[PDB]
Amino acid sequence: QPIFLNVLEAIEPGVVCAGHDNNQPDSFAALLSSLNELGERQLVHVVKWAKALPGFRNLHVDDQMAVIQYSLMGLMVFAMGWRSFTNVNSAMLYFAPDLVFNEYRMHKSRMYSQCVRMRHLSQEFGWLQITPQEFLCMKALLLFSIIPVDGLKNQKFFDELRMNYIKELDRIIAKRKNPTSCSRRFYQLTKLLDSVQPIARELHQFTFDLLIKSHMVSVDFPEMMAEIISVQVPKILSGKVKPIYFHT
Amino acid sequence: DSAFSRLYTRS
Ligand SMILES: C[C@](O)(CS(=O)(=O)c1ccc(F)cc1)C(=O)Nc1ccc(C#N)c(C(F)(F)F)c1
């Protein structure tokens, strides 16, 4: 009875729409105002998703809040690369059904480097034959992959939680009938996971810079995302809060 | 700060 995995499938957010006006010709300000608003909408779903994850109440409430804010970008990216793989086979970026980026939009957004990388990623879901159940567990582990150098309020409990999510991914790995095939798979998946973090880093750096000059470029930030960018994000960019990398 | 706390405390 795959209890952990039933839960992940049970709690998985459904489709979220950006509200972008696709009938207007593409502008940078409107594309990014629509991404910012999509970000907030996806955030609301991530909070409800996270709070219903196995063990999550083990966490101190402040840690609960902190890891959601820190991991948000990496989660969005990961799920987006999967959405782009499943729906359109990596030919475009399926940010949402009403906000799909072709290469013209990738360039018009001014995050082309990041967009092409998220396209690398989307294609790896196919190349590595990632199963839906590998995706779900991987996405969960991602929520517990970014910690502060000064420590959480209860670091022991987070460390127990991460260990056990890694356990679950081990069990998922295990077709089974070969430890060496299990390791090869483990290597590949953890490498895929690690590669989400530089992308989120580039994306964080870009949105930081975009907020700071947003009045200059008529890009609107919702209240909440402006707080997160200005309050949590710089902790990541300043090196106070760091991804946990499997490799080096 | 309070905007994300409030979301988190609410839905
Ligand atoms: C530019 C921005 O709007 C910034 S933001 O959404 O306000 C944001 C602010 C703080 C974060 F930690 C993460 C994202 C953004 O990255 N939006 C965005 C929206 C949806 C999706 C998806 N899916 C993604 C991406 F992660 F896939 F790139 C990115």
Side-chain angles (χ1 to χ4, degrees):
Chain A
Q1 67 289 14
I3 287 155
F4 181 81
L5 199 36
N6 285 347
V7 173
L8 299 187
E9 291 157 336
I11 66 173
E12 178 69 2
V15 181
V16 190
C17 290
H20 181 70
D21 189 346
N22 285 289
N23 305 264
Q24 88 217 138
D26 294 331
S27 52
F28 162 88
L31 287 169
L32 270 286
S33 300
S34 297
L35 282 169
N36 291 340
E37 168 67 25
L38 175 61
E40 168 158 278
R41 294 173 180 201
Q42 286 188 18
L43 175 49
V44 166
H45 288 95
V46 168
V47 168
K48 292 172 170 186
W49 168 77
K51 295 181 82 195
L53 285 160
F56 193 77
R57 291 183 102 199
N58 270 304
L59 292 184
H60 190 105
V61 74
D62 295 343
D63 300 348
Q64 282 181 228
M65 283 178 27
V67 299
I68 294 163
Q69 280 167 109
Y70 302 160
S71 298
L72 176 62
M73 187 62 91
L75 296 161
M76 284 187 144
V77 160
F78 198 63
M80 193 275 284
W82 180 254
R83 271 195 321 276
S84 302
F85 171 60
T86 50
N87 292 327
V88 298
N89 202 38
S90 312
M92 290 173 295
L93 297 176
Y94 205 92
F95 288 93
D98 67 331
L99 192 78
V100 180
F101 280 25
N102 53 32
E103 282 232 343
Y104 175 78
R105 287 189 166 164
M106 296 180 210
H107 172 270
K108 186 132 266 291
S109 70
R110 266 124 78 167
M111 9 181 262
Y112 189 79
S113 52
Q114 300 96 325
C115 277
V116 172
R117 296 165 87 206
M118 286 182 284
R119 194 213 56 212
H120 309 351
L121 174 72
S122 179
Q123 288 184 296
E124 299 212 82
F125 286 106
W127 300 338
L128 294 170
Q129 291 167 186
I130 304 310
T131 77
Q133 292 71 34
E134 288 169 332
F135 166 73
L136 293 172
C137 191
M138 290 192 283
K139 181 159 63 54
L141 189 51
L142 252 195
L143 172 65
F144 308 107
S145 306
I146 181 150
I147 61 166
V149 172
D150 288 337
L152 292 172
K153 256 164 222 77
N154 191 0
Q155 187 72 47
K156 294 157 204 286
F157 278 50
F158 178 95
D159 301 340
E160 173 171 346
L161 208 40
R162 184 177 163 75
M163 180 188 338
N164 289 328
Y165 274 71
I166 298 177
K167 244 91 161 164
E168 297 296 337
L169 185 67
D170 275 317
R171 294 151 178 233
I172 285 170
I173 296 331
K175 236 270 133 270
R176 44 240 138 172
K177 274 61 251 196
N178 190 5
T180 296
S181 314
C182 286
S183 313
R184 201 157 306 184
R185 190 57 167 183
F186 194 77
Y187 175 85
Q188 297 172 317
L189 298 186
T190 49
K191 280 285 197 174
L192 193 67
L193 278 161
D194 284 2
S195 84
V196 178
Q197 305 295 354
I199 320 254
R201 159 92 31 184
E202 259 215 282
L203 283 164
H204 285 312
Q205 181 50 258
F206 172 91
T207 133
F208 177 72
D209 287 350
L210 183 57
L211 178 63
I212 294 314
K213 74 192 205 202
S214 82
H215 295 322
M216 226 62 257
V217 292
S218 40
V219 172
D220 303 324
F221 283 84
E223 17 66 289
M224 173 147 55
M225 311 312 296
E227 156 186 294
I228 293 183
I229 296 152
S230 77
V231 175
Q232 303 299 339
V233 173
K235 301 181 178 183
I236 301 179
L237 299 174
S238 73
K240 284 176 131 173
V241 163
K242 281 172 160 179
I244 291 159
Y245 290 106
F246 275 103
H247 303 280
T248 309
Chain B
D1 262 86
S2 172
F4 176 83
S5 214
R6 184 259 281 111
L7 191 214
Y8 177 104
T9 299
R10 283 179 100 183
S11 263

Short mmCIF file of all heavy atoms in Angstrom, two decimals, chain A residues 32-40 42 68-81 83 94-96 99 111 118 203-204 206-207 210 221-222 225-226 228-229 233 236, ligand 1:
data_model
loop_
_atom_site.label_atom_id
_atom_site.label_comp_id
_atom_site.label_asym_id
_atom_site.label_seq_id
_atom_site.Cartn_x
_atom_site.Cartn_y
_atom_site.Cartn_z
N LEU A 32 5.57 40.08 -17.96
CA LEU A 32 6.11 39.96 -16.60
C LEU A 32 5.07 40.31 -15.53
O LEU A 32 5.04 39.70 -14.44
CB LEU A 32 7.36 40.83 -16.44
CG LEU A 32 8.68 40.12 -16.79
CD1 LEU A 32 9.07 39.13 -15.68
CD2 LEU A 32 8.63 39.40 -18.13
N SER A 33 4.19 41.27 -15.82
CA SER A 33 3.06 41.49 -14.92
C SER A 33 2.19 40.22 -14.83
O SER A 33 1.72 39.86 -13.77
CB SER A 33 2.24 42.73 -15.32
OG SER A 33 3.08 43.87 -15.29
N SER A 34 2.03 39.51 -15.95
CA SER A 34 1.28 38.25 -15.94
C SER A 34 2.04 37.11 -15.25
O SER A 34 1.44 36.31 -14.54
CB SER A 34 0.88 37.86 -17.35
OG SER A 34 0.01 38.85 -17.88
N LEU A 35 3.35 37.05 -15.42
CA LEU A 35 4.16 36.08 -14.66
C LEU A 35 4.15 36.35 -13.16
O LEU A 35 4.13 35.43 -12.37
CB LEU A 35 5.61 36.09 -15.14
CG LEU A 35 5.87 35.34 -16.43
CD1 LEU A 35 7.27 35.67 -16.92
CD2 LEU A 35 5.72 33.84 -16.23
N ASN A 36 4.21 37.62 -12.78
CA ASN A 36 4.19 38.02 -11.34
C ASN A 36 2.89 37.62 -10.70
O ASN A 36 2.88 37.13 -9.60
CB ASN A 36 4.40 39.53 -11.15
CG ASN A 36 5.79 39.97 -11.49
OD1 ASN A 36 6.72 39.16 -11.53
ND2 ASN A 36 5.96 41.27 -11.77
N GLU A 37 1.79 37.84 -11.41
CA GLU A 37 0.45 37.49 -10.92
C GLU A 37 0.30 35.96 -10.91
O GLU A 37 -0.28 35.40 -9.97
CB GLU A 37 -0.63 38.19 -11.77
CG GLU A 37 -2.08 37.75 -11.60
CD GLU A 37 -2.71 38.05 -10.23
OE1 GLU A 37 -2.27 38.99 -9.53
OE2 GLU A 37 -3.68 37.33 -9.86
N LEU A 38 0.82 35.28 -11.95
CA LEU A 38 0.79 33.81 -11.97
C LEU A 38 1.56 33.26 -10.79
O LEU A 38 1.12 32.28 -10.17
CB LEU A 38 1.40 33.26 -13.24
CG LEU A 38 1.53 31.72 -13.30
CD1 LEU A 38 0.20 30.99 -13.21
CD2 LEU A 38 2.27 31.31 -14.58
N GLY A 39 2.71 33.88 -10.49
CA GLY A 39 3.56 33.51 -9.37
C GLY A 39 2.79 33.50 -8.06
O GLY A 39 2.89 32.56 -7.26
N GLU A 40 1.99 34.55 -7.85
CA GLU A 40 1.18 34.67 -6.66
C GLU A 40 0.09 33.60 -6.62
O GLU A 40 -0.15 32.98 -5.59
CB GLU A 40 0.53 36.04 -6.58
CG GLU A 40 -0.55 36.10 -5.51
CD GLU A 40 -0.82 37.50 -5.05
OE1 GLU A 40 -0.04 37.98 -4.17
OE2 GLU A 40 -1.82 38.10 -5.57
N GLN A 42 0.20 30.72 -8.10
CA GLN A 42 0.84 29.43 -7.89
C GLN A 42 1.32 29.33 -6.43
O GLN A 42 1.23 28.26 -5.80
CB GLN A 42 1.97 29.17 -8.90
CG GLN A 42 1.52 28.83 -10.31
CD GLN A 42 2.65 28.40 -11.22
OE1 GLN A 42 3.73 28.04 -10.77
NE2 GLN A 42 2.40 28.42 -12.52
N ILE A 68 8.83 27.41 2.53
CA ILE A 68 7.90 27.63 1.41
C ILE A 68 8.38 28.82 0.62
O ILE A 68 8.37 28.79 -0.60
CB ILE A 68 6.44 27.87 1.83
CG1 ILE A 68 5.84 26.63 2.49
CG2 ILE A 68 5.59 28.23 0.60
CD1 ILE A 68 4.57 26.88 3.29
N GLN A 69 8.81 29.86 1.31
CA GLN A 69 9.26 31.06 0.64
C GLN A 69 10.58 30.83 -0.09
O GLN A 69 10.75 31.27 -1.21
CB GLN A 69 9.35 32.20 1.63
CG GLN A 69 7.98 32.80 1.87
CD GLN A 69 7.93 33.72 3.05
OE1 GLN A 69 7.79 34.91 2.89
NE2 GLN A 69 8.02 33.16 4.26
N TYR A 70 11.49 30.11 0.55
CA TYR A 70 12.80 29.84 -0.05
C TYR A 70 12.76 28.92 -1.27
O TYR A 70 13.48 29.15 -2.22
CB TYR A 70 13.74 29.20 0.99
CG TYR A 70 14.00 30.02 2.24
CD1 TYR A 70 14.46 29.40 3.40
CD2 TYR A 70 13.79 31.40 2.27
CE1 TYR A 70 14.70 30.14 4.56
CE2 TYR A 70 14.01 32.14 3.43
CZ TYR A 70 14.47 31.51 4.58
OH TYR A 70 14.71 32.25 5.73
N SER A 71 11.94 27.86 -1.21
CA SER A 71 11.88 26.83 -2.26
C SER A 71 10.91 27.20 -3.39
O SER A 71 10.88 26.53 -4.42
CB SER A 71 11.44 25.49 -1.66
OG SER A 71 12.36 25.01 -0.68
N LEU A 72 10.15 28.27 -3.22
CA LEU A 72 9.06 28.54 -4.13
C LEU A 72 9.51 28.53 -5.59
O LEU A 72 8.93 27.84 -6.43
CB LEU A 72 8.39 29.86 -3.76
CG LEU A 72 7.29 30.26 -4.74
CD1 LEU A 72 6.17 29.22 -4.75
CD2 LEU A 72 6.76 31.66 -4.38
N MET A 73 10.54 29.28 -5.89
CA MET A 73 11.00 29.42 -7.28
C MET A 73 11.38 28.04 -7.88
O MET A 73 10.94 27.70 -8.97
CB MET A 73 12.19 30.39 -7.32
CG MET A 73 12.66 30.76 -8.71
SD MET A 73 11.35 31.60 -9.59
CE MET A 73 11.76 33.30 -9.14
N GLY A 74 12.16 27.25 -7.14
CA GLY A 74 12.57 25.92 -7.58
C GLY A 74 11.41 24.97 -7.85
O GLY A 74 11.44 24.20 -8.80
N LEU A 75 10.37 25.04 -7.00
CA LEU A 75 9.17 24.22 -7.20
C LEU A 75 8.40 24.58 -8.48
O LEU A 75 7.97 23.71 -9.25
CB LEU A 75 8.24 24.38 -6.00
CG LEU A 75 8.82 23.86 -4.69
CD1 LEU A 75 8.04 24.49 -3.54
CD2 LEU A 75 8.79 22.35 -4.64
N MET A 76 8.20 25.87 -8.66
CA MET A 76 7.51 26.42 -9.82
C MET A 76 8.19 26.00 -11.14
O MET A 76 7.56 25.52 -12.04
CB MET A 76 7.51 27.95 -9.72
CG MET A 76 6.53 28.51 -8.71
SD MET A 76 6.51 30.31 -8.86
CE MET A 76 4.82 30.63 -8.56
N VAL A 77 9.49 26.21 -11.18
CA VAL A 77 10.35 25.75 -12.24
C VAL A 77 10.21 24.25 -12.49
O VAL A 77 10.01 23.82 -13.64
CB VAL A 77 11.81 26.06 -11.82
CG1 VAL A 77 12.79 25.21 -12.59
CG2 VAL A 77 12.10 27.55 -11.97
N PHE A 78 10.33 23.44 -11.43
CA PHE A 78 10.29 21.98 -11.59
C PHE A 78 8.97 21.52 -12.19
O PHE A 78 8.97 20.70 -13.13
CB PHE A 78 10.47 21.25 -10.26
CG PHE A 78 10.86 19.78 -10.40
CD1 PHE A 78 12.07 19.43 -11.00
CD2 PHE A 78 10.05 18.78 -9.91
CE1 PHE A 78 12.46 18.10 -11.14
CE2 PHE A 78 10.43 17.45 -10.03
CZ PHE A 78 11.63 17.10 -10.64
N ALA A 79 7.87 22.05 -11.64
CA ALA A 79 6.54 21.64 -12.07
C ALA A 79 6.28 22.16 -13.47
O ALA A 79 5.56 21.53 -14.23
CB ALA A 79 5.46 22.13 -11.10
N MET A 80 6.88 23.30 -13.79
CA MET A 80 6.67 23.92 -15.08
C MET A 80 7.36 23.09 -16.17
O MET A 80 6.76 22.81 -17.20
CB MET A 80 7.16 25.37 -15.06
CG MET A 80 6.71 26.17 -16.27
SD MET A 80 7.80 25.97 -17.68
CE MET A 80 9.20 26.97 -17.21
N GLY A 81 8.62 22.71 -15.94
CA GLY A 81 9.35 21.80 -16.84
C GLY A 81 8.63 20.49 -17.11
O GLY A 81 8.64 19.99 -18.23
N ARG A 83 5.10 20.14 -16.72
CA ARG A 83 3.99 20.62 -17.54
C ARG A 83 4.37 20.86 -19.00
O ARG A 83 3.62 20.55 -19.90
CB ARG A 83 3.39 21.92 -16.96
CG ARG A 83 2.29 21.65 -15.95
CD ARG A 83 1.45 22.88 -15.62
NE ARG A 83 2.25 24.10 -15.54
CZ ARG A 83 2.93 24.50 -14.46
NH1 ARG A 83 2.94 23.78 -13.34
NH2 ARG A 83 3.62 25.64 -14.51
N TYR A 94 5.19 25.73 -20.86
CA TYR A 94 3.82 25.70 -20.38
C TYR A 94 3.75 26.32 -18.96
O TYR A 94 3.52 25.63 -17.96
CB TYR A 94 3.30 24.27 -20.45
CG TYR A 94 1.82 24.15 -20.57
CD1 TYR A 94 1.19 24.08 -21.82
CD2 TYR A 94 1.02 24.11 -19.44
CE1 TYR A 94 -0.19 23.97 -21.93
CE2 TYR A 94 -0.36 24.01 -19.54
CZ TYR A 94 -0.96 23.94 -20.78
OH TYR A 94 -2.35 23.83 -20.83
N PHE A 95 3.96 27.64 -18.88
CA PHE A 95 3.83 28.37 -17.62
C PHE A 95 2.42 28.19 -17.10
O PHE A 95 2.22 27.92 -15.93
CB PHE A 95 4.13 29.86 -17.78
CG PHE A 95 5.59 30.17 -18.00
CD1 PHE A 95 6.11 30.27 -19.27
CD2 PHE A 95 6.43 30.37 -16.93
CE1 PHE A 95 7.46 30.58 -19.46
CE2 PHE A 95 7.77 30.67 -17.11
CZ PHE A 95 8.29 30.77 -18.38
N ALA A 96 1.47 28.33 -18.00
CA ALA A 96 0.07 28.04 -17.72
C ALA A 96 -0.62 27.81 -19.04
O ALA A 96 -0.03 28.04 -20.08
CB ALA A 96 -0.58 29.21 -16.98
N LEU A 99 -0.71 31.01 -20.76
CA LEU A 99 0.59 31.70 -20.75
C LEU A 99 1.70 30.71 -21.11
O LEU A 99 2.54 30.35 -20.30
CB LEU A 99 0.86 32.41 -19.40
CG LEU A 99 2.06 33.37 -19.42
CD1 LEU A 99 1.76 34.73 -20.08
CD2 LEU A 99 2.60 33.60 -18.01
N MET A 111 14.35 37.03 -19.97
CA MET A 111 14.90 35.89 -19.24
C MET A 111 15.09 34.71 -20.19
O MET A 111 14.62 33.61 -19.94
CB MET A 111 14.00 35.50 -18.06
CG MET A 111 12.66 36.20 -17.99
SD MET A 111 11.76 35.67 -16.54
CE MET A 111 10.73 34.43 -17.29
N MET A 118 15.32 26.07 -18.63
CA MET A 118 14.10 25.41 -18.20
C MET A 118 13.58 24.54 -19.33
O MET A 118 12.81 23.61 -19.09
CB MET A 118 13.04 26.43 -17.78
CG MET A 118 13.33 27.07 -16.44
SD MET A 118 12.06 28.23 -15.90
CE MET A 118 12.37 29.68 -16.90
N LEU A 203 16.78 33.15 -11.83
CA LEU A 203 15.41 33.68 -11.83
C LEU A 203 15.23 34.63 -10.64
O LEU A 203 14.75 35.75 -10.82
CB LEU A 203 14.37 32.56 -11.84
CG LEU A 203 14.13 31.86 -13.19
CD1 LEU A 203 13.40 30.54 -13.01
CD2 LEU A 203 13.39 32.72 -14.19
N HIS A 204 15.71 34.23 -9.46
CA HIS A 204 15.74 35.10 -8.30
C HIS A 204 16.49 36.39 -8.55
O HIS A 204 16.08 37.47 -8.13
CB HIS A 204 16.44 34.42 -7.12
CG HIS A 204 15.63 33.35 -6.44
ND1 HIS A 204 14.32 33.55 -6.06
CD2 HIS A 204 15.97 32.12 -6.02
CE1 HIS A 204 13.87 32.46 -5.46
NE2 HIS A 204 14.86 31.58 -5.43
N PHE A 206 17.13 37.87 -11.39
CA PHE A 206 16.38 38.65 -12.36
C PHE A 206 15.14 39.31 -11.75
O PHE A 206 14.86 40.48 -12.06
CB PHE A 206 15.97 37.73 -13.51
CG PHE A 206 15.03 38.36 -14.49
CD1 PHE A 206 15.51 39.02 -15.60
CD2 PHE A 206 13.65 38.29 -14.29
CE1 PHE A 206 14.64 39.60 -16.49
CE2 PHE A 206 12.78 38.87 -15.18
CZ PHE A 206 13.28 39.52 -16.29
N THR A 207 14.39 38.59 -10.92
CA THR A 207 13.20 39.21 -10.36
C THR A 207 13.58 40.24 -9.33
O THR A 207 12.94 41.31 -9.26
CB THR A 207 12.07 38.26 -9.86
OG1 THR A 207 11.60 38.66 -8.55
CG2 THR A 207 12.46 36.82 -9.87
N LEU A 210 14.38 43.18 -11.30
CA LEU A 210 13.14 43.71 -11.85
C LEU A 210 12.30 44.48 -10.81
O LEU A 210 11.80 45.55 -11.12
CB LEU A 210 12.33 42.59 -12.50
CG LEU A 210 11.03 43.03 -13.19
CD1 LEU A 210 11.28 44.09 -14.27
CD2 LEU A 210 10.36 41.80 -13.78
N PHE A 221 3.91 44.47 -9.38
CA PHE A 221 4.09 43.36 -8.47
C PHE A 221 2.96 43.32 -7.46
O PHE A 221 2.61 44.35 -6.85
CB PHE A 221 5.40 43.47 -7.75
CG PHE A 221 6.56 43.08 -8.58
CD1 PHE A 221 7.15 44.00 -9.45
CD2 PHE A 221 7.07 41.79 -8.52
CE1 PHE A 221 8.24 43.64 -10.23
CE2 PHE A 221 8.17 41.42 -9.29
CZ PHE A 221 8.75 42.34 -10.15
N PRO A 222 2.36 42.14 -7.28
CA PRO A 222 1.42 42.07 -6.20
C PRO A 222 2.15 42.31 -4.89
O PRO A 222 3.34 41.95 -4.76
CB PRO A 222 0.87 40.65 -6.31
CG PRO A 222 1.01 40.33 -7.77
CD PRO A 222 2.35 40.92 -8.11
N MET A 225 4.25 39.32 -3.41
CA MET A 225 5.47 38.89 -4.10
C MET A 225 6.56 39.93 -3.93
O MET A 225 7.73 39.57 -3.81
CB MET A 225 5.21 38.65 -5.58
CG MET A 225 4.00 37.78 -5.89
SD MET A 225 3.92 36.28 -4.91
CE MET A 225 5.41 35.46 -5.50
N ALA A 226 6.18 41.20 -3.86
CA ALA A 226 7.13 42.29 -3.55
C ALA A 226 7.75 42.13 -2.16
O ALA A 226 8.91 42.42 -1.96
CB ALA A 226 6.45 43.64 -3.66
N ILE A 228 8.10 39.18 -0.51
CA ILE A 228 8.95 37.98 -0.57
C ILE A 228 10.28 38.22 -1.28
O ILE A 228 11.34 37.86 -0.78
CB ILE A 228 8.21 36.85 -1.28
CG1 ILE A 228 7.02 36.40 -0.40
CG2 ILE A 228 9.18 35.71 -1.59
CD1 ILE A 228 6.25 35.22 -0.96
N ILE A 229 10.21 38.84 -2.44
CA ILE A 229 11.38 39.27 -3.19
C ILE A 229 12.27 40.17 -2.35
O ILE A 229 13.50 40.03 -2.35
CB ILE A 229 10.97 40.05 -4.46
CG1 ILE A 229 10.19 39.17 -5.44
CG2 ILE A 229 12.19 40.61 -5.16
CD1 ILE A 229 9.21 39.93 -6.33
N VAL A 233 14.01 36.57 -0.64
CA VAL A 233 14.92 36.40 -1.79
C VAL A 233 16.36 36.92 -1.60
O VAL A 233 17.28 36.23 -2.03
CB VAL A 233 14.30 36.99 -3.07
CG1 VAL A 233 15.30 36.99 -4.25
CG2 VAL A 233 13.04 36.20 -3.43
N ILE A 236 18.84 34.58 -0.08
CA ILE A 236 19.37 33.56 -0.96
C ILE A 236 20.49 34.15 -1.79
O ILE A 236 21.54 33.55 -1.96
CB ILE A 236 18.27 33.01 -1.88
CG1 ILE A 236 17.14 32.41 -1.04
CG2 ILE A 236 18.86 31.98 -2.82
CD1 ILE A 236 15.98 31.86 -1.85
C1 LIG C 1 9.25 36.88 -12.37
C2 LIG C 1 8.31 36.17 -11.41
O1 LIG C 1 6.97 36.64 -11.60
C3 LIG C 1 8.74 36.46 -9.98
S1 LIG C 1 7.57 36.00 -8.88
O2 LIG C 1 6.63 35.12 -9.51
O3 LIG C 1 6.92 37.17 -8.32
C4 LIG C 1 8.37 35.20 -7.74
C5 LIG C 1 8.75 35.86 -6.58
C6 LIG C 1 9.47 35.18 -5.60
C7 LIG C 1 9.82 33.85 -5.78
F1 LIG C 1 10.50 33.23 -4.82
C8 LIG C 1 9.46 33.19 -6.95
C9 LIG C 1 8.73 33.87 -7.93
C10 LIG C 1 8.37 34.68 -11.69
O4 LIG C 1 9.42 34.07 -11.54
N1 LIG C 1 7.20 34.18 -12.08
C11 LIG C 1 6.97 32.90 -12.45
C12 LIG C 1 5.62 32.53 -12.52
C13 LIG C 1 5.23 31.23 -12.82
C14 LIG C 1 6.19 30.26 -13.09
C15 LIG C 1 5.79 29.04 -13.37
N2 LIG C 1 5.37 27.98 -13.62
C16 LIG C 1 7.64 30.63 -13.01
C17 LIG C 1 8.77 29.65 -13.27
F2 LIG C 1 9.31 29.26 -12.14
F3 LIG C 1 8.37 28.56 -13.91
F4 LIG C 1 9.70 30.27 -13.96
C18 LIG C 1 7.97 31.95 -12.70
#
